[PDB]
Design a protein around this ligand. Structure first.
Ligand SMILES: [Mg+2]
Ligand SMILES: [Mg+2]
Ligand SMILES: [Mg+2]
Ligand SMILES: [Mg+2]
Ligand SMILES: [Mg+2]
Ligand SMILES: [Mg+2]
Ligand SMILES: [Mg+2]
Ligand SMILES: [Mg+2]
Ligand SMILES: [Mg+2]
Ligand SMILES: [Mg+2]
Ligand SMILES: [Mg+2]
Ligand SMILES: [Mg+2]
Ligand SMILES: [Mg+2]
Ligand SMILES: [Mg+2]
Ligand SMILES: [Mg+2]
Ligand SMILES: [Mg+2]
Ligand SMILES: [Mg+2]
Ligand SMILES: [Zn+2]
Lengths: 79, 126, 192, 59, 136, 49
RNA sequence: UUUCUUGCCGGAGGUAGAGCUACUGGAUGGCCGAUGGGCCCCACAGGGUUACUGACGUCAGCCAAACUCCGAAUGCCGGU
RNA sequence: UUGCCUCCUAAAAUGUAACGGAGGCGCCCAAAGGUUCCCUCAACCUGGACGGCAAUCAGGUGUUGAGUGUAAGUGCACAA
RNA sequence: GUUACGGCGGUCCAUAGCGGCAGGGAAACGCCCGGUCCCAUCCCGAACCCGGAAGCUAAGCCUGCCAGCGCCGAUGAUACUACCCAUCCGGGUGGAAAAGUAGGACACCGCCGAACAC
């Protein structure tokens, strides 16, 4: 006999790439995801594939707004 | 023992305005540099506030409630024109030139458009 | 009806957590919490023999006078953690009560009496929820099925409560269902 | 206070974190002893290697 | 025999025989019951055997509850087959039984006959079990 | 086949500026849309070649 | 010294466990009674009854790698 | 059986094998794309000519159980 | 400054909701009156929009009071667990739920504007 299974797709390496308090440059990808598990917050953009990325440099800050989990960039104080 | 059975039109209207105001707010936000000009329109009056949504603070306000506006002899659009001029003057005194107009969930036109056009005419940039 | 408090010696725990608790049980003590309307949780150990004997004599809802560092406190057994296998009491929740206080308690409904000969009595509620005074809590409520025929459905509203005792469970709860005794044919179908 | 810490067991078979905690305490051979201040950092290192060391309190 | 009418997943990983039962550890329907003291897969054939043993002993005038339903499939490969070529077809239905779980309950007027009946059932089960009452 | 590749050419200068697909049964007619033409440096009508 | 180790601080998570009147399925016994079914009035209509059958609902006891209202310990990323 | 996509296995970052457990793809849409503006399902209860469990109409309850071209998952009622 | 007041916001967005009982109209918010005018209905001035002020707090909105349903929720204990002892089972140090209980809760905070006081 034989199995009708044996198939799978490539692992897509999704997930949080920059965690809380990490300093990021503008443009840096913060999360890779399929829907809006995380929503864009302040100075965070949403890509066409729902990637969240930084619009300005600063520290990554996770927070909740109206229950929706959100990723934010907070400006870091200049030296 | 009268018990109302459904929703009065005023209830439906109130929450539907709030709904579509929230919809507009997804994109329109105010800052100290570019405040949000919020308009509230009643049957009798029209009110405007300049809001900085970062602090949640009002920089300048104007309304048809003011005696200066109540003295106006024209129709409700004429009062809207006066309120538009008053808010531009008070905003420019507050150090503001550029604003983003928030129609408050009402159709852009009529009294709302007459206020916005009077504000533009008095030199608010929007 | 009026119950006298049963005296138990109790000492404040020096240490808390599973290590301390396991050692206490190994040395024959049961850990307990005392908490109250006064919002002042105390961590105690009771002697396992004495506490178990009180529960055997006066049931799960026994009223106790605890002796804590020489101060007597009135308390009610709120809840018991019993290990499913060893059947030992792991932990006790004790609620402080002042005399004359209303307490909501679950009491055991016993069934007494010879049902009509072709009858099987099935008890569907082990317990009913009651409001009573701290000292008036009956240790067991008895319902009599001495005569009822098949089809009868003793409900919670039909059970005698002493004075002071109020029913909090809704009256529609079936406590006893009386059914005509299954034939051998019905035993063979049931659970097939 | 001070703690005298003596290595009692081999590092053979010990995990990376255990072996490196011994290095961080300054222990490199069985029966070697180091003197360390009793602080949180020192306690955490001891907790990682408590089965490999003997701890004695000084003062 | 007890079989589920349908299952969403007909080929399942084996149930894990770890931990003490957290649910169904007391007698809730009858006055007597059988409490498991060991881990096992109890099959529907064992349940049937045990239930009929209880019925035969009491003859009539009692009620038997089965607190456990064998909805977990175990597969089997065809005989004399090499390893590989896909997972076998479902063959047995079992309940994952943990110590503390009450498996059977009985209501009967006579305690002596009730205990004997439950003993007859215990000898049918793959595990060690004791008789437990509603009382503390 | 069902959705063949079509080339859009500028009506003015006829440079083949774009390539896209259409269902030829849903749109038998030659597709006509406005597109930016680099040669002309302005949006112009483009038509399927 | 950027590596590693230990303490502390900032993070995301859905495993262990647990829970399910929180969803999708499985599922035990009561209670209630649509639904067919039998029968009496007898017209096929409107109704009154039955050792049948049982939806939906409700009370109590449960189960799941591809269930989750919940949810660790560890591990991982960063800062110090 | 061989490439690609989704889930579980996978041990709460990522990754993770087997002739392990389940499915899908080799397109489709000139709008089912862009933008502006507006709206809120499904199910259930009640009333109404054909018309019935269910067509279209009216009122009420209903926060999401509907719907998202097409597998599955993550999302989406603020709507996607 | 004080108000059964009108807006715009905020809260890791229900401790804020749902529901019940009672009450409020000074300026506001509202229903409300009416389609000549900008504008509007896949039909309908119902809605959207405009022009008004005869009526009314009956609803929305607002205030007070109920723990009935939702919601939040310890302490302790347990389950589980990292590391370490332990020839089979178990145990120690550290972390520590879910459920349940005591109980909380009929929201709270910021800016502007009314009206009245000064
Ligand atoms: Mg995948
Ligand atoms: Mg896109
Ligand atoms: Mg795309
Ligand atoms: Mg070794
Ligand atoms: Mg359970
Ligand atoms: Mg077409
Ligand atoms: Mg977390
Ligand atoms: Mg599990
Ligand atoms: Mg799970
Ligand atoms: Mg992973
Ligand atoms: Mg992992
Ligand atoms: Mg490999
Ligand atoms: Mg007035
Ligand atoms: Mg009208
Ligand atoms: Mg009123
Ligand atoms: Mg706790
Ligand atoms: Mg909890
Ligand atoms: Zn051209």
């Amino acid at each position: 006999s034989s199995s009708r299974n044996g198939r799978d797709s490539a692992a897509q390496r999704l997930g949080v790439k920059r965690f809380g308090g990490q300093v990021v440059k503008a443009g840096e990808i913060l999360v890779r995801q399929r829907g809006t598990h995380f929503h864009p917050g302040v100075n965070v953009g949403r890509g066409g594939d729902d990637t969240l990325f930084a619009l300005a440099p600063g520290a990554v800050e996770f927070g909740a707004k109206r229950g929706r989990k959100t990723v934010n960039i907070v400006p870091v104080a200049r030296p | 023992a009268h018990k109302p059975v459904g929703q009065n039109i005023s209830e439906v209207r109130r929450n539907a305005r709030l709904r579509r105001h929230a919809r507009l707010r997804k994109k329109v936000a105010g800052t100290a540099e570019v405040p949000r000009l919020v308009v509230n329109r009643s049957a009798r009056h029209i009110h405007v506030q300049l809001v900085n949504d970062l602090n949640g603070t009002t920089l300048a306000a104007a309304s048809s409630i003011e005696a200066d506006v109540r003295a106006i002899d024209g129709d409700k659009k004429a009062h809207s024109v006066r309120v538009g001029q008053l808010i531009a003057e008070r905003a420019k005194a507050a150090g503001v030139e550029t604003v983003v107009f928030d129609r408050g969930g009402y159709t852009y036109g009529g009294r709302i458009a007459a206020l916005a056009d009077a504000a533009r005419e008095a030199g608010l940039k929007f | 009806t009026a119950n006298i408090p049963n005296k138990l010696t109790a000492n404040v725990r020096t240490r808390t957590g599973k290590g301390a608790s396991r050692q206490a049980r190994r040395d024959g003590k049961v850990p307990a919490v005392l908490y109250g309307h006064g919002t002042d949780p105390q961590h105690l150990e009771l002697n396992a023999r004495d506490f178990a004997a009180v529960l055997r004599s006066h049931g799960t809802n026994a009223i106790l006078t605890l002796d804590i560092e020489g101060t007597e406190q009135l308390a009610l057994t709120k809840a018991l953690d019993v290990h499913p296998i060893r059947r030992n009491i792991q932990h006790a929740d004790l609620l402080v009560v002042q005399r004359g206080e209303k307490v909501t308690v679950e009491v055991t409904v016993l069934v007494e009496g010879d049902a009509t000969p072709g009858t099987l009595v099935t008890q569907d509620a082990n317990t009913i929820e009651i409001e009573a005074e701290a000292l008036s809590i009956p240790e067991q409520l008895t319902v009599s099925v001495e005569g009822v025929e098949a089809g009868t459905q003793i409900t919670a509203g039909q059970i005698s409560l002493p004075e002071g005792v109020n029913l909090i469970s809704d009256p529609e709860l079936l406590v006893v269902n009386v059914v005509e005794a299954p034939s051998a044919e019905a035993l063979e179908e049931e659970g097939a | 206070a001070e703690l005298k810490i003596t290595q009692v067991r081999s590092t053979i078979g010990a995990r990376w974190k255990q072996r490196e905690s011994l290095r961080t305490l300054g222990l490199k051979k069985i029966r070697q002893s180091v003197v360390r201040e009793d602080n949180a950092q020192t306690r955490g290192l001891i907790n990682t290697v408590h089965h490999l060391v003997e701890v004695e309190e000084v003062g | 025999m007890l079989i589920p009418r349908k299952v969403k997943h007909r080929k399942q990983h084996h149930p894990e025989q770890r931990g003490i039962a957290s649910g169904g550890t007391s007698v809730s329907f009858g006055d007597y019951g059988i409490q498991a003291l060991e881990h096992a897969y109890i099959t529907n054939r064992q349940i049937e055997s045990a239930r009929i043993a209880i019925n035969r002993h009491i003859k009539r005038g009692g009620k038997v509850w089965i607190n456990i339903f064998p909805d977990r499939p175990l597969t089997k490969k065809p005989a004399e087959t090499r390893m590989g070529s896909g997972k076998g077809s479902p063959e047995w239905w079992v309940a994952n039984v943990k110590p503390g779980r009450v498996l059977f309950e009985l209501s009967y007027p006579d305690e002596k006959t009730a205990r004997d009946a439950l003993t007859r059932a215990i000898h049918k089960l793959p595990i060690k079990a004791r008789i437990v009452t509603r009382e503390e | 086949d069902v959705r063949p590749k079509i080339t859009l050419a500028c009506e003015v200068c006829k440079h083949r500026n774009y390539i896209t697909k259409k269902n030829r049964r849903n749109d038998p007619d030659r597709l006509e849309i406005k597109k930016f033409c680099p040669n002309c440096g302005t949006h112009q009508p483009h038509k399927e070649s």
